[model samples]
Target: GSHMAQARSPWSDTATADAFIQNFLAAVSGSGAFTSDQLDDMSTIGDTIMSAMDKMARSNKSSQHKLQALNMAFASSMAEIAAVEQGGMSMAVKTNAIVDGLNSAFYMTTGAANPQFVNEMRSLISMISAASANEVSY
Candidate 1:
């Protein structure tokens, strides 16, 4: 539930997530592998994920399941963006692994009621951003 809450939180609004996803799309779209429509479609996916999160919050029994799904989706999206921005098979593989590892850590820590999970996730995101900063030169 926390993951879903965070996604819908003020700090992680549509504008922020859209900007993050679009910037990654722009970096990778130049390769001609994804059409403009495809990029937009990816952005839509992010928006939809957030919307689902909102719905999940209002509902009771299914909230945890939905939140877990949202977390996985968010992690996968970030991993894809990181791989695309990195621009090499090796870098992509490494970045994806890192993202997946972080996701697992997030799930485990949050599930265990660790108070530091949020901060850990934030630090992890910042590290990922720094690692991919070089590829955003547009």
Candidate 2:
């Protein structure tokens, strides 16, 4: 039995994550068809990915697995930000892409190390994804 230390995400704390999300979204322009609430939820997912990364960075003894997971997380988030910046798709499609990226990052990072938190985060991500499926106000 090889139980590891659980990695906690500071960004799961709503107030702190919300503050970061607000600041992060403030700089993002041309968020067409995404309502304020959707943007908030979307940014929360990004922050969660970054939160897992921060945990990985702070660990004293890193493993090959941790390092690889961090790279995946970084790649996924960067791709999401680049897509958001480029902006030529429906809000539904854009949001779905972000969700996909978030899933990729999650599976790479926290999903590997933090089994206790996975179900909660999975539910949260699913809820946001469901909300995005209704982005048809063009």
Best by TM-score: 1
Model 2 agreement with the true structure over 74-133: per-residue lDDT tens digits: 334534444444455444455444334333344443344343543444444344434444
lDDT of each: 0.48, 0.47
Most accurate candidate by lDDT: 1
Error of 2 at 127 (Å): 17
lDDT of 1 by residue, 33-138 (tens): 5567645655566677757646655654444555456655665565445555555535533343333343343333333233254445445544556655555656
Model 2 has an lDDT value of 0.47
The runs of at least 3 residues in candidate 1 whose Cα sits more than 4 Å from the true structure, single-residue gaps closed, are 1-34, 61-66, 74-138
Q: How many backbone clashes does candidate 2 have?
A: 0
Candidate 1 clashing pairs, residues 3+ apart or interchain: none
**Residue 78 local lDDT, model 1:** 55
